[PDB]
Design a protein around this motif. Sequence first.
Motif, PDB file in Angstrom:
ATOM      1  N   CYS A   1       6.149   3.855  29.218  1.00  0.00           N
ATOM      2  CA  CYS A   1       4.704   3.681  29.183  1.00  0.00           C
ATOM      3  C   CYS A   1       4.331   2.493  30.055  1.00  0.00           C
TER       4      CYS A   1
ATOM      5  N   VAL B   1       1.866   0.443  30.300  1.00  0.00           N
ATOM      6  CA  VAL B   1       1.117  -0.723  29.851  1.00  0.00           C
ATOM      7  C   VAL B   1       2.054  -1.814  29.350  1.00  0.00           C
ATOM      8  N   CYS B   2       2.952  -1.481  28.427  1.00  0.00           N
ATOM      9  CA  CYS B   2       3.841  -2.471  27.836  1.00  0.00           C
ATOM     10  C   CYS B   2       5.280  -2.364  28.308  1.00  0.00           C
TER      11      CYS B   2
ATOM     12  N   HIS C   1       2.599   5.770  20.602  1.00  0.00           N
ATOM     13  CA  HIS C   1       2.734   4.387  21.047  1.00  0.00           C
ATOM     14  C   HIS C   1       1.464   3.873  21.714  1.00  0.00           C
TER      15      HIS C   1
ATOM     16  N   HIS D   1      -2.108   0.336  21.998  1.00  0.00           N
ATOM     17  CA  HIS D   1      -2.887  -0.325  23.034  1.00  0.00           C
ATOM     18  C   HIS D   1      -4.355   0.052  22.977  1.00  0.00           C
TER      19      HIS D   1
HETATM   20 ZN   LIG Z   1       2.486   0.829  25.788  1.00  0.00          ZN
END
Ligand SMILES: [Zn+2]
Lengths: 59, 49, 138, 98
Positions: free
Chosen positions: A5, A7-8, A21, A25
């Motif tokens: 993913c 973003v993280c 998940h 966010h």
């Molecule tokens: Zn994420």
Amino acid sequence: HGYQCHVCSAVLFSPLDLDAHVASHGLHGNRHITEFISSWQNHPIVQVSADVENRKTAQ
Amino acid sequence: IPVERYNILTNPDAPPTQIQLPEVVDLYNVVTRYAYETPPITAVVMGVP
Amino acid sequence: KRIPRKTKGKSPATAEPGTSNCEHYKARPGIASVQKATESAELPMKNNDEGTPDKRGNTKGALVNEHVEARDEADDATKKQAKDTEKAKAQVTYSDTGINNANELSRSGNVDNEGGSNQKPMSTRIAEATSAIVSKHP
Amino acid sequence: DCRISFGMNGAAPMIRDETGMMVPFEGNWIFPLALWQMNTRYFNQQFDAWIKTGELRIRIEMGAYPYMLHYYDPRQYANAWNLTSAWLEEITPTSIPS
Ligand SMILES: [Zn+2]
């Protein structure tokens, strides 16, 4: 390989796992308390409540 | 039937959020319904050089 | 949805690069050691409800004197201190300090919240107080 | 000072300058080696796709480094990603390989 993913930068496995998940966010796809992931080692650490009977890599 | 309770049905000039709360408790009010989200604590932790 | 209570109540397109699973870096203080050390400090401390009433009315706890309770309380905490970092006798002691602390008090069930003694519980004292004054039929 | 903000709804994900400027994943960059060391995993998944096919170029200031050599035939086709990405993966907060 397992796919991540953006973003993280977590190593997700399944599309259902990714859509579970990304709601942490805040985006909407198509439980536990803290989610801290590092940047120099592949070792995410999560916390779960004290009464839950399993703790398989869980704080 | 107590007309003093069911106010905003029977009063022709009543604002919908008027409550007569100290005098008479009344049924049939206007409630605000929510649907929130509680995300977990998250933080991507990165080191300083 | 249902959430249980803890206590007892009243009632084939792409495959992107970059990812790997090699794990070359090892934890330099050691993540598992810092986990096990953080666990014990994470715990909140216990309380004592000594001298405080229960639902029924009496103050719960032992019958020992307050200062004797403080002394063997410190001695029992020294005995607990000896068990961590396993030795015969503890090193960081709480009793047998060089200082005279003889005017110290801690809570026990010897007293109530009124100020009197508690050899007889408040429930039985109230029961005898209300049962000294009754009258029957003719 | 560097942080990475994610791109949303088609916008390119940006990264912060020492002058406090957000730039897209493109161009000529200059890193100290210790920055990439301290964030050697989070930067791989964000940066390696833009170096292979994209147009991003990084000068990593190191000073001294041991090297290796690999020879190829100029009559045959040759690519260097299977060695380069191995090096960029094996950079570690403690060590680097040749
Ligand atoms: Zn994420």
